[PDB]
Design an enzyme around this catalytic site. Structure first.
Site, PDB file in Angstrom:
ATOM      1  N   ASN E 106     -24.790 -11.259   5.074  1.00  0.00           N
ATOM      2  CA  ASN E 106     -25.650 -12.305   4.542  1.00  0.00           C
ATOM      3  C   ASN E 106     -26.431 -11.991   3.252  1.00  0.00           C
ATOM      4  O   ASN E 106     -26.590 -12.901   2.450  1.00  0.00           O
ATOM      5  CB  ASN E 106     -26.684 -12.712   5.597  1.00  0.00           C
ATOM      6  CG  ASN E 106     -26.095 -13.494   6.745  1.00  0.00           C
ATOM      7  OD1 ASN E 106     -25.212 -14.356   6.592  1.00  0.00           O
ATOM      8  ND2 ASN E 106     -26.623 -13.215   7.917  1.00  0.00           N
ATOM      9  N   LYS E 158      11.409  -3.319  -7.917  1.00  0.00           N
ATOM     10  CA  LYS E 158      11.533  -4.552  -8.687  1.00  0.00           C
ATOM     11  C   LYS E 158      12.982  -4.561  -9.146  1.00  0.00           C
ATOM     12  O   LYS E 158      13.317  -3.943 -10.142  1.00  0.00           O
ATOM     13  CB  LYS E 158      10.589  -4.527  -9.883  1.00  0.00           C
ATOM     14  CG  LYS E 158       9.155  -4.214  -9.503  1.00  0.00           C
ATOM     15  CD  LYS E 158       8.240  -4.191 -10.714  1.00  0.00           C
ATOM     16  CE  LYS E 158       6.808  -3.955 -10.283  1.00  0.00           C
ATOM     17  NZ  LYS E 158       6.455  -4.793  -9.109  1.00  0.00           N
ATOM     18  N   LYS E 160      16.621  -5.662 -10.738  1.00  0.00           N
ATOM     19  CA  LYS E 160      17.034  -6.394 -11.910  1.00  0.00           C
ATOM     20  C   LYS E 160      18.121  -7.408 -11.581  1.00  0.00           C
ATOM     21  O   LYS E 160      18.520  -8.177 -12.454  1.00  0.00           O
ATOM     22  CB  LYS E 160      17.568  -5.429 -12.968  1.00  0.00           C
ATOM     23  CG  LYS E 160      16.517  -4.541 -13.604  1.00  0.00           C
ATOM     24  CD  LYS E 160      17.095  -3.764 -14.776  1.00  0.00           C
ATOM     25  CE  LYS E 160      17.937  -2.588 -14.310  1.00  0.00           C
ATOM     26  NZ  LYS E 160      19.158  -3.002 -13.564  1.00  0.00           N
ATOM     27  N   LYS E 184       8.474   1.417  -2.321  1.00  0.00           N
ATOM     28  CA  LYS E 184       7.339   0.565  -1.983  1.00  0.00           C
ATOM     29  C   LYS E 184       7.755  -0.909  -2.053  1.00  0.00           C
ATOM     30  O   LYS E 184       8.142  -1.383  -3.107  1.00  0.00           O
ATOM     31  CB  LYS E 184       6.150   0.883  -2.902  1.00  0.00           C
ATOM     32  CG  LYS E 184       4.952   0.092  -2.599  1.00  0.00           C
ATOM     33  CD  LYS E 184       3.712   0.543  -3.234  1.00  0.00           C
ATOM     34  CE  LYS E 184       3.327  -0.286  -4.360  1.00  0.00           C
ATOM     35  NZ  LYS E 184       2.981  -1.654  -3.900  1.00  0.00           N
ATOM     36  N   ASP E 186       6.689  -4.418  -2.683  1.00  0.00           N
ATOM     37  CA  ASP E 186       5.557  -5.095  -3.323  1.00  0.00           C
ATOM     38  C   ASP E 186       4.649  -5.803  -2.313  1.00  0.00           C
ATOM     39  O   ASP E 186       5.104  -6.395  -1.332  1.00  0.00           O
ATOM     40  CB  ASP E 186       6.085  -6.056  -4.357  1.00  0.00           C
ATOM     41  CG  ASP E 186       5.029  -6.576  -5.285  1.00  0.00           C
ATOM     42  OD1 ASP E 186       3.794  -6.459  -5.037  1.00  0.00           O
ATOM     43  OD2 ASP E 186       5.440  -7.028  -6.375  1.00  0.00           O
ATOM     44  N   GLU E 187       3.352  -5.748  -2.603  1.00  0.00           N
ATOM     45  CA  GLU E 187       2.311  -6.261  -1.716  1.00  0.00           C
ATOM     46  C   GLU E 187       2.500  -7.751  -1.354  1.00  0.00           C
ATOM     47  O   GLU E 187       2.159  -8.130  -0.249  1.00  0.00           O
ATOM     48  CB  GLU E 187       0.914  -6.043  -2.310  1.00  0.00           C
ATOM     49  CG  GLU E 187       0.653  -6.721  -3.643  1.00  0.00           C
ATOM     50  CD  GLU E 187       0.879  -5.739  -4.805  1.00  0.00           C
ATOM     51  OE1 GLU E 187       1.551  -4.694  -4.579  1.00  0.00           O
ATOM     52  OE2 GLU E 187       0.333  -5.943  -5.891  1.00  0.00           O
ATOM     53  N   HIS E 277      -2.259  -0.907   1.056  1.00  0.00           N
ATOM     54  CA  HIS E 277      -2.393  -1.485  -0.261  1.00  0.00           C
ATOM     55  C   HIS E 277      -3.688  -2.277  -0.415  1.00  0.00           C
ATOM     56  O   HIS E 277      -4.146  -2.922   0.503  1.00  0.00           O
ATOM     57  CB  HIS E 277      -1.222  -2.345  -0.550  1.00  0.00           C
ATOM     58  CG  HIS E 277      -1.084  -2.738  -1.958  1.00  0.00           C
ATOM     59  ND1 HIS E 277      -1.726  -3.834  -2.469  1.00  0.00           N
ATOM     60  CD2 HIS E 277      -0.336  -2.241  -2.967  1.00  0.00           C
ATOM     61  CE1 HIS E 277      -1.470  -3.931  -3.753  1.00  0.00           C
ATOM     62  NE2 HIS E 277      -0.596  -3.005  -4.074  1.00  0.00           N
ATOM     63  N   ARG E 278      -4.280  -2.227  -1.575  1.00  0.00           N
ATOM     64  CA  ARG E 278      -5.662  -2.692  -1.727  1.00  0.00           C
ATOM     65  C   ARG E 278      -5.764  -3.996  -2.526  1.00  0.00           C
ATOM     66  O   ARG E 278      -6.705  -4.183  -3.287  1.00  0.00           O
ATOM     67  CB  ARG E 278      -6.512  -1.593  -2.344  1.00  0.00           C
ATOM     68  CG  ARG E 278      -6.116  -1.202  -3.767  1.00  0.00           C
ATOM     69  CD  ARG E 278      -7.216  -0.529  -4.418  1.00  0.00           C
ATOM     70  NE  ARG E 278      -7.028  -0.231  -5.835  1.00  0.00           N
ATOM     71  CZ  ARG E 278      -7.904   0.435  -6.590  1.00  0.00           C
ATOM     72  NH1 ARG E 278      -9.037   0.905  -6.093  1.00  0.00           N
ATOM     73  NH2 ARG E 278      -7.638   0.632  -7.810  1.00  0.00           N
ATOM     74  N   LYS E 317      -8.584   5.650 -18.694  1.00  0.00           N
ATOM     75  CA  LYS E 317      -9.980   5.640 -18.301  1.00  0.00           C
ATOM     76  C   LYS E 317     -10.729   6.771 -18.989  1.00  0.00           C
ATOM     77  O   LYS E 317     -10.179   7.844 -19.231  1.00  0.00           O
ATOM     78  CB  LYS E 317     -10.166   5.727 -16.762  1.00  0.00           C
ATOM     79  CG  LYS E 317      -9.617   4.514 -16.057  1.00  0.00           C
ATOM     80  CD  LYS E 317     -10.280   4.181 -14.735  1.00  0.00           C
ATOM     81  CE  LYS E 317     -10.052   5.232 -13.645  1.00  0.00           C
ATOM     82  NZ  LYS E 317     -10.447   4.639 -12.369  1.00  0.00           N
ATOM     83  N   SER E 362      -1.365   5.229  -9.494  1.00  0.00           N
ATOM     84  CA  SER E 362      -0.432   4.731 -10.489  1.00  0.00           C
ATOM     85  C   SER E 362      -0.240   5.824 -11.564  1.00  0.00           C
ATOM     86  O   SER E 362      -1.195   6.237 -12.221  1.00  0.00           O
ATOM     87  CB  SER E 362      -0.971   3.435 -11.059  1.00  0.00           C
ATOM     88  OG  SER E 362       0.002   2.630 -11.643  1.00  0.00           O
TER      89      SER E 362
END
Lengths: 444, 22, 138, 444, 444, 142, 138
Positions: E106, E158, E160, E184, E186-187, E277-278, E317, E362
């Site tokens: 809350n 992924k 092709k 992996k 994909d999410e 996965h986030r 970063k 990544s």
């Protein structure tokens, strides 16, 4: 494949365990009747060729249906009744699905035929006893409902105010409280966005128990269990069981024989009554030259299992169409039915103590058909009123009460020896003097 | 929802109701 | 500091916490029903059928959730299709209470657009009912 | 990946089956709006780079969201609305979880954006019909509760004497007996050392049935089913079922959409009502520049399934923030909602007969907000009173009775054609003359 | 409710069993910090008012969070860190869902605050031990995978040529055969019309076993178990179990903590590894002034249970954003983490032997980031390559082989004592001399 | 029930979510095509009468199929194609059984028709997506 | 327009919606029984056992479906095997009502061919029963 001397065997003696079929057959012009009857007997693996191609099988030596008789149809010029015997070894015990697959699976496409109608089937005692059959049947149903010596009275609920589950249940309550034994889910009401099934079941159960507390008589509503899947269907049947309500409903031709038989067995195992609705029957059973006559579909239903079956109306039908209807009503209800061509019964049927099914008749718009219905059906029938109860000017409950008074006065008059064909108008007018509800229905 | 416009009842409505109740 | 009484203090849903609606108060509610295009209807019950109960649940398995008996009352005549004037409802209220003096009477309303009951409030309590309190319920 | 010409296609015609999204978008300075809209459409597999790197995919040729329109936001200088169409083939049928994964899963981290807020979604009829949705919805709920023509009244239980299950139940009884339809588990009350869930359920069930016997009206308490695990959650839902109690509760954003949808299906299958609490919504929905606006989260909830939803308060809000609240209240409740930008509705939403959800409004501290609440929400809402009932000097039951009197007098006055914006204080003061409980609440 | 003197108790001695929270707090102008810290401690039942109204509860007497310290943030003018202690009795044992509900349910809507961010939580040993936690954790995972002394490698699939299940599996097999430990889902790939889940599972299982037969190493693919419902989710987890495959995947923030914890327990009970996965984390965790920092969401995940967690990239970063990332990587992996403000760690966290979670990083577009990744993460990490393997000119398998060579040469050079910050380009160029696959990736 | 003006609505615009049906229709001699198309649209609760009797329902106000077009069949003299729209709310999601019950359940017995054939159905995307459908389909199978 | 009353308006299956059968009406029904070869029998119940109830279902699991108590009534003497004359049934009706003045009395009939009860209709209501309406039930 259609040799005519292999499959048309007119000196074959019919065995007691054989399944017999009578096909009304319309050959292509120039194709002789013996070739067509043999082709229907054979179910050739070529339906577009119309000729023998690959001949000599062990599916076609001892597991062959034989055309043992071809008769002309009187008054017709190109139609024949072909009689086919099938050995009982062809059929999966207890599977209506498999009997239709074996008999009607392929021959209706055969190119040598222009049209083909399956009129009747003789189901032998040896095959009949493999079926569970109706969960209760007419007798048990009357004992469980405590209702003797008259027809049962139903009506379909078409609410004036909404199709919501709560309004649906209000209307059920109003009809049942007035005197009807049953009300009826419409055959398409399964579970929609306007009314989900479990909400419908709960509000109908409150209505049934309210009218039962009020009348002191056993009450039901045919709760439609027809679903997309067997698991959804059984979810609904289980809900009815847990509500402790008396009866559910299935649309056996659109759900299917496999689902109907599963449901009928659930109902036998849990003491539910099973009302059977015959939606799509006219896709199959209406045209005189093609399809499957309803008496066959009724016989199938009695084997698959149902305690009631929609059996049509006899309003607006000629005497000959009424002879036919009474024929299949006897196949539905009786233990032993004799061969009777003028009633369209082509085979002696011995049900071998399989319980009968209660026909459900559409009563007309009004209560003046009550004497004819009681005379034609006798007591073992449900009379459904489609707007007798609700076209009544005072509403559902007096309309129900007007139908119940009219049924009971016609029943009383019948037991007193009066001729309902002649005196039925006089019976109704005499009950109008003391019943204001019946008097208001006859003002209409 | 529409605005509920009032309906003056008939002048004898109180009286009509009284006779009916008896 | 007063105590809301638990004895003989039954309520009948919408408007039961107000004083009993007078004839002018009923007429003004009927005006609200008519202006909205709603269909008034009357319903009635005897005192033993008037409030929610669980007695049918004896027949059940584990499915009593939101089941209750006596939500349905008994319809008085028919839904007043085409009702435009409030004096017909007031006449029908008098007629129902005259035929059924020991009955609670409720006025309901149906909305044919949304195809559902849309109102329900009580218009008459029976004098012989001891189940309810005459607004000295503290 | 963000080519701007592949993904920004401003002459695309929106299909009927597409899912549309409106993103309020804040580009990094110097990044043009068409490049940001395209990047959000693309969901590039590099969120740090903000440039194409690996281009050409069968996940990015026919399964690509397209930015079909970018509009400026009036009064803002660096904010745009980007409209993205997603083909319906992208989405798992009936899975709110998967729709948020597809739409919001990755784009909110993209470095070319400074801030990103998801304002609205157009859920097409073809996707809407894959969801079970709310177990009952507003209509069915009113029929099952037998409660028509007013708001429902709730209150949260905060006991004065202990948080034990028994004292919790005493307070539930006192509030419900006085006139409230519902009481409410606090959202954090799941099962603690001070009060284990099954003890809470049992004492609340005694309270609900006691107040129901006393009032003669249907009563509920929102029993919090939120758990650490799906098995524990279903253990609680099953317990409520077996107690035969009407309603349970879930915190759908902290439990999760996967658990909420499982619970909503259990509730449809067993006739429980499902109250939905929106704890943590302000983590996501509060900041104007970033997150997911509540109307999207409400639309998600309506798809996942809930019969009630906490919808905020309108106490203390300006007319413009009240326009927004009424926008999402219409998306919660109505069948068809028209595009209306000033109410924050960016898309025409057709719910295609999916049942509406009852908004739950925080009423204020006192009963003088009752005229405003009735005028703004109308009858289809629960008004929750946080201390109206319990800040009342005579205790819970007269406080409940004071709230119920005020709601009913405002309802009466509204139906009589009075203007509650002007005359609501005069309605309350007039009810104070005959109601001592309401008169004591207005002394405060 | 926000008295400032009940709830702000600077003298308070923090208990061993308390749950501590650090809120970065942005008060509305003119509202003093002690009043805001107290309001967050209180979680007042009025979020609009920002003033005491109903005061005196047994929910506010012994189960109250206390604000025990308020500290300003250097360089900011209107931001404070408020420290709140919560007694362990507030929380349901083993329920991350309930922990979130109690702390962030809350207060993020409270009007006295302009913005509120939850930076860190101290989870006490007494609460930590109520959780099942990660099914295996890093150590159990390395033993089960037989893979020691380097990072793991994975790639997202992924294709092709199509998104069909069969083409999906071809690409997996190709990726796995070249040298990657994992691939992996994909999410968003859950079960779509283009690729239904069970078909995907079967073809991926053929690919995993083909590459395993070929390489002789243990291989996996993260099979996405994320579903609309708990039952569908467990249907998928059960399928993976029966295929005997090593690892499944869940999107814990969009599925929810209730479903994630259920899944983590299934995985512990049946020896499956759980990749987490986030997706949607940046809806919550991105804005500095509002939401919930990822380190809290990572700590939640470690409690709810996951064997791997997507932990971002450190490509692109700055050193200060890297210091933050390494802070939460230590909270994910280590047994005991000391207070360290410059790494954003506000509390000493004792995991009390709860198994660590493996961060998934990544990796960049190319293989030249390999020395930096090995230096920053060390060996206990999965490095995911988004197009290293597939932007490679010779295809998936040489791309996988180029990533594996680069990882292993950087690992070798690190063990030899070389400085990867300085000499990593020299390490890669030296491995290019003997590896044609790595030499072709560098050419790019 | 077969008013011809309630159910035959030739200016109706077909919605995207409607289920459409094309019935090849053979009216009884003397029965006009617009009356037959309307009767098939209505599924009157009297199939023997072929006339309105009990009129005014909430099953027949918003849950009604409408005959929106009648065309002659070329080369035939007594056959018409009647196009009927059904609102998607009529149908149980995912239940082929219930769609045939709703569309073909009763009208093939209607006495105003001599013969009736159901030629085609337009299944809308909104109804199509409620079905699980084929376990694999051609591609997956290959 | 009249309202079918829900109060004290219990029915007892076949013929209960007609006026109470006179002695000549009972005699004519008995003639129907005799001509068919059926076996008449009388049954009786006190008012609290006269109509269907669910009280035994308290003992049950989920098997209440089509169970109801009070379908069985109590037999008066024995089935009148070989009954040919209707005056014996009329005598037995008088004797049962004389022994049991507060009892409903029903006349049933059994068909020994189909081995099943085939009729059942009421011949006597007790005056002291308030459960039923004297055909001014509206």
């Amino acid at each position: 494949k259609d040799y005519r001397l292999t499959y048309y065997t007119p000196d074959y003696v019919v065995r007691d365990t054989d399944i017999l079929a009578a096909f009304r057959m319309t050959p292509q012009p120039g194709v002789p009747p013996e070739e067509c009857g043999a082709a229907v007997a054979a179910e050739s693996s070529t339906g577009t060729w119309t000729t023998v191609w690959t001949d000599g099988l062990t599916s076609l030596d001892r597991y062959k249906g034989r055309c043992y008789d071809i008769e002309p149809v009187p008054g017709e010029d190109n139609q024949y009744i072909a009689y086919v015997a099938y050995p009982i070894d062809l059929f999966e015990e207890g599977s209506v699905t498999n009997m239709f697959t074996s008999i009607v699976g392929n021959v209706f496409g055969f190119k040598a035929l222009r049209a083909l109608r399956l009129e009747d089937l003789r189901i032998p005692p040896a095959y009949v006893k493999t079926f569970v059959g109706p969960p209760h049947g007419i007798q048990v149903e009357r004992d469980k409902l405590n209702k003797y010596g008259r027809g049962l009275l139903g009506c379909t609920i078409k609410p004036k105010l909404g199709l919501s589950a709560k309004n649906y249940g209000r209307a059920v309550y109003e009809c049942l409280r007035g005197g009807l034994d049953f009300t009826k889910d419409d055959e398409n009401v399964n579970s929609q966005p306007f009314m989900r099934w479990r909400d419908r079941f709960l509000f109908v159960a409150e209505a049934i128990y309210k009218a039962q507390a009020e009348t002191g008589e056993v009450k039901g509503h045919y709760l439609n269990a027809t679903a997309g899947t067997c698991e959804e269907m059984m979810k609904r049947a289980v809900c009815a069981k847990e509500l402790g309500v008396p009866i559910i409903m299935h649309d056996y031709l659109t759900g299917g024989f496999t689902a109907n038989t599963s449901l009928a067995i659930y109902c036998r195992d849990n003491g539910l009554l099973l009302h059977i609705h015959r939606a799509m029957h006219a896709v199959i059973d209406r045209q005189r030259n093609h399809g499957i006559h309803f008496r066959v579909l009724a016989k199938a239903l009695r084997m698959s299992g149902g305690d009631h079956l929609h059996s049509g109306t006899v309003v607006g039908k000629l005497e000959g169409e009424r002879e036919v209807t009474l024929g299949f009503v006897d196949l539905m209800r009786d233990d032993y039915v004799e061969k009777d061509r003028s009633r369209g019964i082509y085979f002696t049927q011995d049900w071998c103590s399989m319980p009968g099914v209660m026909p459900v008749a559409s009563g007309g718009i009004h209560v003046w058909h009550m004497p004819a219905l009681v005379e034609i059906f006798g007591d073992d029938a449900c009379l459904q009123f489609g707007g007798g109860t609700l076209g009544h000017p005072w509403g559902n409950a007096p309309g129900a009460a007007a139908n119940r008074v009219a049924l009971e006065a016609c029943t009383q008059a019948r037991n007193e020896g009066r001729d309902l064909a002649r005196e039925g108008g006089d019976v109704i007018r005499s009950a109008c003097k003391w019943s204001p509800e019946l008097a208001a229905a006859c003002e209409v | 929802a529409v605005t509920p416009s009032r309906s003056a009842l008939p002048s004898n409505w109180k009286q009509e109701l009284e006779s009916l109740r008896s | 500091m007063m105590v809301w009484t638990p004895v003989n203090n039954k309520m009948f849903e919408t408007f039961s916490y107000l004083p009993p609606l007078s004839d002018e108060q009923i007429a003004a509610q009927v005006d609200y029903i008519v202006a909205n295009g709603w269909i008034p209807c009357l319903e009635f019950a005897e005192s033993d059928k008037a409030y929610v109960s669980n007695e049918s649940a004896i027949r059940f398995g584990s499915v009593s959730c939101l089941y209750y008996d006596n939500r349905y009352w008994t319809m008085w005549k028919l839904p007043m299709f085409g009702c435009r004037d409030p004096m017909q409802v007031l006449r029908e209220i008098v007629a129902c209470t005259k035929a059924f003096p020991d009955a609670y009477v409720r006025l309901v309303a149906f909305d044919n657009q949304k195809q559902v009951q849309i109102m329900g409030f009580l218009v008459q309590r029976p004098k012989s009912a001891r189940d309810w309190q005459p607004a000295n319920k503290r």
